[PDB]
């Protein structure tokens with residue numbers, strides 16, 4: 047084909063990001079992948095006159111023993127001119143019964159990339175113990191993991207699918223990056239056939255597009271459940287009050303006076319205290335309030351979407367999606383997957399992935415993550431467990447002790 | 459000696475132009491010097507010499523190679539370089555000894571004057587001009603057609619060119635390892651001498667076929683080789699033992715420097731100390747000052763000297779064997795580790811001396827060494843070692859299964875090599891029945907450093923001290939401090955300090971604050987401690 051002219055947002059310059067050291071295993075894999083890719087003319091070695099650079103690594107896909115090449119164009123994307131021609135987010139898959147994701151990265155190689163922009167797609171395969179200088183390349187086609195790629199391929203995509211979009215206007219399909227989400231209310235029976243069907247429809251043109259299901263009709267948010275014991279001690283009451291007092295940020299209707307009174311004196315924590323009828327009423331009201339999510343929560347797309355995560359221990363993890371503190375749009379829990387019997391990083395990673403995945407579905411938009419972990423630890427191993435063509439934005443933090451004890455009290 | 463390789467395209471930074479500096483006058487003995495010599499340059503193969511066109515004057519003074527007394531031309535592109543684009547990382551890092559493998563023979567060809575064998579970008583040569591004013595008026599100008607000393611892109615490009623040029627030979631010979639650094643060419647192999655020697659010449663000839671003249675086997679370099687302070691052999695590497703000078707008069711800068719070279723060594727010879735020399739610097743007035751020398755100061759220097767005596771024998775990396783990484787705690791926050799495959803056959807060794815913050819604990823620190831080591835390894839061996847750590851599995855398991863932050867350790871194994879890292883304490887998960895209950899509380903007037911901090915128990919015990927010169931948190935923590943003091947082996951402590959909660963919570967066992975450190979001591983000293991937090995004013999008291 048041809049190639050439409052692309053540019054960086056004015057004033058900006060190509061990323062000059064440092065390559066992190068990769069393990070041998072990965073290094074060889076990539077080298078193998080890139081030579082083949084070079085032969086096909088999808089990429090070309092470059093000289094030093096090219097000062098730009100982006101990170102790359104390899105990750106094996108789920109249910110695959112084949113190494114997949116992955117690049118971090120986050121910076122580049124940040125800098126490439128927004129295209130405005132964008133992608134329309136539906137709202138159906140949000141409500142659909144079942145969804146499946148298709149990896150259509152291959153489609154992107156077919157089409158070539160503007161020559162004056164190729165330079166910016168430069169990347170470097172490192173050498174162990176810096177024995178040799180790096181093997182540098184740059185793309186000739188439309189690379190995977192770039193925001194422009196789905197964009198410049200958008201049109202071709204439409205027609206490619208139309209024959210299915212027309213033949214089945216009862217099924218939804220959303221494209222985001224190298225991804226493709228398709229949801230149908232049809233049972234996993236007549237479903238898989240239609241997906242594997244659509245699958246073929248694509249393989250038709252030529253772009254190899256191969257548990258694996260989703261269910262958006264089971265997640266949205268959950269309530270904060272208050273304890274409920276037979277006899278309450280001073281400590282019990284204390285803790286309880288601490289939580290509420292904090293919850294009063296999400297629900298101003300929450301009262302904590304009656305309770306707090308009983309806590310007047312200098313009694314032992316183990317001391318058992320009988321509840322005031324007035325106190326029992328108060329609590330009843332709070333229980334009532336907390337039953338449902340706070341009012342007045344609208345998703346504004348003009349502003350970024352945020353995602354916090356609290357490690358709760360026992361493989362447990364909690365999260366909240368929000369664009370403004372205390373006005374979460376969704377909140378949830380995640381229980382580790384049998385395998386990370388002793389690995390925190392593995393879990394976190396997985397988690398991060400679901401959450402992003404969901405965002406896409408709901409609002410087709412990746413959230414910025416506030417990860418309770420050291421930058422050091424995260425960058426050392428996140429790659430070793432990652433499995434997604436995209437890479438969300440992130441920052442590391444110190445889990446404020448309150449917020450955790452709080453959401454810890456989520457509908458179990 | 460001009461090479462037939464396609465020059466690489468070099469552009470000046472966009473929105474900028476070639477230099478314009480002036481040539482500063484020179485003696486008459488330096489003039490006739492650069493004169494009678496530059497005439498050779500063009501005679502060689504690089505058509506250098508121009509006129510009124512391309513007015514990009516560049517300074518050209520002359521300094522003799524003191525040990526020959528014969529002026530060999532020289533230039534300064536400081537400006538040009540400024541106005542030249544950027545290339546890519548020229549040596550993101552140097553190969554560390556512990557990552558090389560052993561070889562039967564290693565040679566290095568001094569391909570010195572190679573920069574001048576490579577063709578410069580023609581459309582760029584332009585931006586290179588001279589000016590050799592004779593003596594009087596007349597108000598003798600050259601340029602470049604080949605990479606020059608001093609130019610920003612000379613090395614960058616050269617390396618690459620070299621890279622290309624070697625690609626074939628490298629394939630026809632995958633049993634010969636070459637390494638390019640600067641203007642040198644390291645070559646190793648496991649061939650029988652005679653074979654090596656011939657491939658070497660084969661290669662030596664191959665380069666020359668490209669215009670790259672090189673030295674004959676009669677004038678080359680031979681092992682052992684001088685590396686990163688490492689003495690290298692094809693079978694082993696050794697630490698070039700360096701001994702500290704015996705000084706009569708010790709100056710500030712002297713210690714500063716001595717203490718530096720000292721710290722470097724500590725990695726290799728763990729046992730080196732400098733705490734007592736780090737103290738001769740306190741209050742230092744000027745760099746040239748002459749400080750005494752405490753006896754504790756000489757006992758160190760003298761004791762350090764003993765150590766830095768017997769050198770270090772080390773072995774290279776065997777891809778065949780698995781990597782073992784073992785660590786030990788030199789003290790609080792100071793760790794020593796060593797990597798090896800065959801016990802005692804140390805590949806690499808080290809020491810990390812982590813500082814302290816508002817909260818840290820040996821376990822967490824241990825963790826940080828591991829991550830560092832790991833990374834270090836990946837970089838050198840592309841693999842991560844199996845670890846031998848001085849912590850008990852139960853200890854680890856109970857810790858990380860409670861920490862608020864995400865943490866992990868690769869496959870590791872316990873090693874009872876005391877002192878073992880352990881948890882100095884653990885807060886109770888619930889109130890201790892049959893224990894006093896202190897309701898600590900502290901207040902201080904922010905502006906006027908002064909407040910009070912006290913407590914009151916369920917056993918009706920009370921106390922409050924006035925504090926002159928303090929802040930909010932110092933008091934809070936202090937309240938807590940107090941509670942702990944006069945309390946007993948089992949204590950419950952309610953407090954509303956938001957900050958304090960976290961601190962203590964996270965079982966920190968070392969801090970910047972002496973106050974916090976106070977608390978820790980106490981906390982350790984107790985049998986069982988429950989700590990509870992309650993909302994601010996109004997209500998609980």
Ligand SMILES: CCOc1ccnc(CCNC(=S)Nc2ccc(Cl)cn2)c1F
Pocket residue numbers: 177553557558559560561564635636637644645646681683684685690691692693774
């Ligand atoms: C003086 C070391 O110079 C070199 C530095 C980096 N790389 C090479 C080539 C690789 N050689 C290898 S794997 N082993 C190796 C062992 C001992 C010595 Cl003395 C030199 N090289 C070098 F020869």
